[PDB]
């Protein structure tokens, strides 16, 4: 079991946010 702290949780949340943003940007760019 991986025991992460609060900073890893914040980093994971920011990385998921960035992944969603990159998905949106990739969709917008493949539309154009």
């Amino acid at each position: 079991g991986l025991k992460v702290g609060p900073v890893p949780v914040l980093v994971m949340s920011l990385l998921f946010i960035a992944s969603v943003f990159m998905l949106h940007i990739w969709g917008k760019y493949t539309r154009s």
């Binding site: 079991g1 991986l2 609060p6 949780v9 949340s13 969603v20």
Partner: protein, 449 residues
Amino acid sequence: LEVIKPFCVILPEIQKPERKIQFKEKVLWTAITLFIFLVCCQIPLFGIMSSDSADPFYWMRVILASNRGTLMELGISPIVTSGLIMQLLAGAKIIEKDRALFNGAQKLFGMIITIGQSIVYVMTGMYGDPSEMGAGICLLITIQLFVAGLIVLLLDELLQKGYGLGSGISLFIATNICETIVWKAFSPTTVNTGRGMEFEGAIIALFHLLATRTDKVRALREAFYRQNLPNLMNLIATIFVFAVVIYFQGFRYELPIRSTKVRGQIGIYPIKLFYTSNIPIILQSALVSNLYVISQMLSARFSGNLLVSLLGTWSAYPVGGLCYYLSPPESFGSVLEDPVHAVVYIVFMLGSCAFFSKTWIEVSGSSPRDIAKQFKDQGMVINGKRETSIYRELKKIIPTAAAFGGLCIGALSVLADFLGAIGSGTGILLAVTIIYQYFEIFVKEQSEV
């Protein structure tokens, strides 16, 4: 144990804070957690073809801290589902290092129910028809909601393991309610209906109306009694309800108790008037929201059935049925038009809140019997009363206190709904009670210091 042992040690887990986190750092971590929750609440999902449909779960957006079409479409749903399923398993005794196993099992079950809920949400018709999106887009939306639910669970454990204050459910619900109120009070969005630019925020609208309009009295009237957008009467009502709930939440019956085993531990035992802190509001709001959602589903699928029609008739607000008498009146003109509906709604609110409080004191171990057992455990006899009259005084105070607290909180919700305050009675009461819980945590930490 069973065969679920391997799978309960796969999801991430939050380590103990080792030290004791100071209140300033706990506040900072709570602020970071709510900031993450809000930021993810403002980020839309990917693959949504159209959000022009009608929200099937619109009534569970305040009680679940959700936001349609975004990463927090489910909101606090994983936490609630995991807690409910684990309570069901523990009560029926199938599943009772034990703490680590319990946490792993609750995470796994919450995430499985999160996947099921994401599938249900996709199939409800929102985001467009699930056939035009395709299996790839449906799976992508499900994966995004899965990761969002995992993040929500991680934030909840971050709050509950000692890094932050309170829990994820209360923090997120209060944050959503406060954000809604502040948006309705300060939004810069302008809606034009031919008259001119009109800010949605009540205070910004007041300032713009005063600045632009040549007739200041007319601007004041149209900014205070505005009906197309939130006005200043709504804000004044919201502040007034805040004040009254704050005043009544400080009510407490202080029982002077003294220890008999360890002499010298003289203290005070306060019995608050709001004995069940916003528990009646939570129960009533959850019941009403769920009843509304299943009523909407049944009306959409089985329109015409007498059983469905009596459950509630929907136009997206009830216009008849059992779900219509459970709804706050939109305006006082509706109260004047239909007084029977208003009377039934008031009676339902008061009775349901009182009954929920009186049931919860027994269910959660807050009845005079358990408090008397605790007093016997610590020898905490009353200074004036004898050791054989603890149960009598507890029966005198606690049941009446709980019943009247439920009655008063229901009456406050009814008053906030009748005044048309921003965020309705449910949201206002939930937010203020959660903030008071955080203030109680603060004063407890200060007392420890």
